[PDB]
Amino acid sequence: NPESADLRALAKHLYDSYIKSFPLTKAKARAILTGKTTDKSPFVIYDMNSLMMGEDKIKFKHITPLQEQSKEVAIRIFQGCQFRSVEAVQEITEYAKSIPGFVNLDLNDQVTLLKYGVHEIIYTMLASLMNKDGVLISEGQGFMTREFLKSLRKPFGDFMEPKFEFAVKFNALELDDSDLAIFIAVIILSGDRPGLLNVKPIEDIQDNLLQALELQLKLNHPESSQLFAKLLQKMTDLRQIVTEHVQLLQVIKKTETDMSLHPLLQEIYKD
Numbered sequence: 001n002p003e004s005a006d007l008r009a010l011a012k013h014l015y016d017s018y019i020k021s022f023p024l025t026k027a028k029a030r031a032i033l034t035g036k037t038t039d040k041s042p043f044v045i046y047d048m049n050s051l052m053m054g055e056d057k058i059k060f061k062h063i064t065p066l067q068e069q070s071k072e073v074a075i076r077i078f079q080g081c082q083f084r085s086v087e088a089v090q091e092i093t094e095y096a097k098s099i100p101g102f103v104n105l106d107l108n109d110q111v112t113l114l115k116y117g118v119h120e121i122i123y124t125m126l127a128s129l130m131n132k133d134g135v136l137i138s139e140g141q142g143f144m145t146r147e148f149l150k151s152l153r154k155p156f157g158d159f160m161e162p163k164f165e166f167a168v169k170f171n172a173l174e175l176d177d178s179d180l181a182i183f184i185a186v187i188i189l190s191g192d193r194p195g196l197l198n199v200k201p202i203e204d205i206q207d208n209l210l211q212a213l214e215l216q217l218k219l220n221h222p223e224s225s226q227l228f229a230k231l232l233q234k235m236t237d238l239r240q241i242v243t244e245h246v247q248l249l250q251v252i253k254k255t256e257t258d259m260s261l262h263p264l265l266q267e268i269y270k271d
């Protein structure tokens with residue numbers, strides 16, 4: 001069909017830019033997590049002992065020097081959790097520029113779409129690095145168990161749990177990276193974001209993106225019926241984790257007044 005080819009060439013385009021923008025794809029994460037072993041076998045951190053024992057191999061050097069070794073383990077892990085967020089935002093930003101028409105919208109809308117969109121995308125991509133037992137870290141060289149993160153000092157202990165809760169339900173849909181590329185594009189171009197000056201051009205692109213996603217899911221998963229509707233229904237789960245993420249940030253801000261934030265997050269954190 002002549003009109004379907006525009007959507008599939010659009011899917012091929014977003015898939016191509018997805019691979020170019022994100023080094024940690026779901027396919028590589030799944031290769032490490034299944035028992036294909038030898039070279040890509042990760043080191044596992046399950047308790048405070050293995051953590052110090054793995055700092056030789058875990059590359060825990062990416063912790064901010066101003067607020068690094070002096071702080072307790074619970075704050076440091078939170079610091080590394082936020083350091084993987086600046087990297088995702090940078091990559092989502094580079095990814096957003098490749099979505100056709102995005103760079104042609106108003107600048108203020110572009111900043112608005114990224115300010116509210118990156119967090120919903122982060123937890124979507126974080127699910128690719130997760131199973132029921134833990135999450136990949138250090139570019140797949142490490143694996144931090146869900147049990148150990150859950151055991152951290154409060155409220156940092158119950159901060160990774162809602163992401164693990166979302167990952168197990170989201171990973172049940174069995175989407176690959178070709179589907180996630182289009183879905184991530186749909187999340188960016190939401191016309192219902194607060195402060196959008198011109199909403200109509202944003203909705204026009206998301207129509208085209210949703211058309212591409214529905215056709216992509218029908219061809220890549222022909223046996224899974226209503227995968228389109230069930231995938232769109234899981235953003236209600238994505239806005240909830242976001243809303244409790246903003247709730248523990250203001251708690252940490254007044255509990256840990258001596259803790260810095262990366263300027264990219266401090267600007268995103270304004271709601």
Ligand SMILES: CCCCCN1C(=O)C(=O)c2cc(SCCc3ccc(C(=O)O)cc3)ccc21
Nearest residue numbers: 059060077080081084085088122125126137138
């Ligand atoms: C994939 C898209 C962006 C994800 C951003 N991101 C979160 O938002 C989040 O909550 C979270 C939680 C962890 S787990 C504990 C933190 C941690 C991080 C890195 C290392 C390391 O040494 O590599 C060690 C520990 C990791 C990444 C996270």
Ligand SMILES: [Cl-]
Nearest residue numbers: 084085087088
């Ligand atoms: Cl990252």
